[PDB]
Design a protein around this ligand. Structure first.
Ligand SMILES: *CCC(=O)N1CCC[C@@H](n2ncc3c(N)ncnc32)C1
Length: 275
């Protein structure tokens, strides 16, 4: 429903001019996203703006993503929408403000991200894809580090569903393909290096994926055996032998970080402090 903004129980009748524009965030990968402040509360939020005069293709993608996120109001690992504003000229989609994405944390850190953090990250992302395949029959089709968002309070959510209904897997080029993309992302963040960084064209990446063996987590960085095993599983070329989430969620690596307390909130704020 339009016109209402609800930040945690408290619902507020509001309109666009009840918000102060604090500047844009990054690029318009799905839409133009502003950081905005609620003049009544003081709360600052992310607001995506869709202009009705905008690109027809981008607008179809923004509506799909919204469709998925309103459906996912009860997944703690998918960013929550706080409400919508519909004016004669624009649609304003209020999202909870996250910090940044794993891609930019990799930039800031200038090196590997510790297994402790990638652990909590694997739990939140696998359960997100599982919740999305089970309760709604959607699959993501674009899981990559720029789509994994974090915040200062430790939360790790998944964010961009604009091309999602029902980093590319071998059988998505040559017929659980979101399982492959998660593994490529995990190897990138774990080593700080993208495993197909020397390819000068898109098709050259696709030939590497099908011709050479999967990128494996190296053995000399102290990675635990469970983490190495989990990545080897996701990075199975033959999709017939790749596990579904019900089997993935029973992996020991998943089980270690469901229970273990990992202070990602502190690790996040220190990385962001370093320039
Ligand atoms: C890699 C992260 C990044 O640069 N982007 C693209 C720009 C928009 C940004 N972003 N999208 C939704 C967001 C929410 N809800 N909070 C914070 N940043 C957000 C992701």
């Amino acid at each position: 429903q339009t016109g209402y903004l609800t930040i945690g129980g408290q619902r507020y009748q509001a309109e666009i001019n009840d918000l102060e524009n604090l500047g844009e965030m990054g690029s318009g990968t799905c839409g133009q996203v502003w950081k905005m402040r609620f003049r009544k509360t003081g709360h600052v939020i992310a607001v995506k703006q869709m202009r009705r005069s905008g690109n027809k293709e981008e607008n179809k993608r923004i509506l799909m993503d919204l469709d998925v996120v309103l459906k996912s109001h009860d997944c703690p690992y998918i960013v929550q929408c706080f409400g919508t504003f519909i004016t004669n000229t624009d649609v304003f989609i209020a999202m909870e403000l996250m910090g940044t994405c794993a891609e930019k944390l990799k930039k800031r850190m200038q090196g590997p991200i510790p297994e402790r953090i990638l652990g909590k990250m694997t739990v939140a992302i696998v359960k997100a894809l599982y919740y999305l395949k089970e309760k709604h029959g959607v699959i993501h089709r674009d899981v990559k580090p720029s789509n994994i968002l974090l915040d200062e309070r430790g939360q790790i959510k998944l964010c961009d569903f604009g091309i999602s209904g029902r980093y590319m897997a071998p059988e998505r080029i040559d017929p659980r393909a979101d399982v492959w993309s998660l593994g490529i992302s995990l190897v990138e963040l774990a080593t700080g290096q993208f495993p197909y960084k020397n390819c000068k064209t898109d098709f050259e990446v696709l030939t590497k994926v099908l011709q050479e063996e999967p990128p494996l987590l190296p053995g000399h960085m102290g990675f635990s055996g469970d983490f190495q095993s989990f990545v080897k599983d996701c990075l199975t070329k033959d999709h017939r032998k790749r596990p579904k989430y019900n089997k993935l969620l029973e992996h020991s690596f998943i089980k270690r970080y469901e229970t273990l307390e990992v202070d990602v909130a502190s690790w996040f704020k220190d990385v962001m402090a370093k320039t």
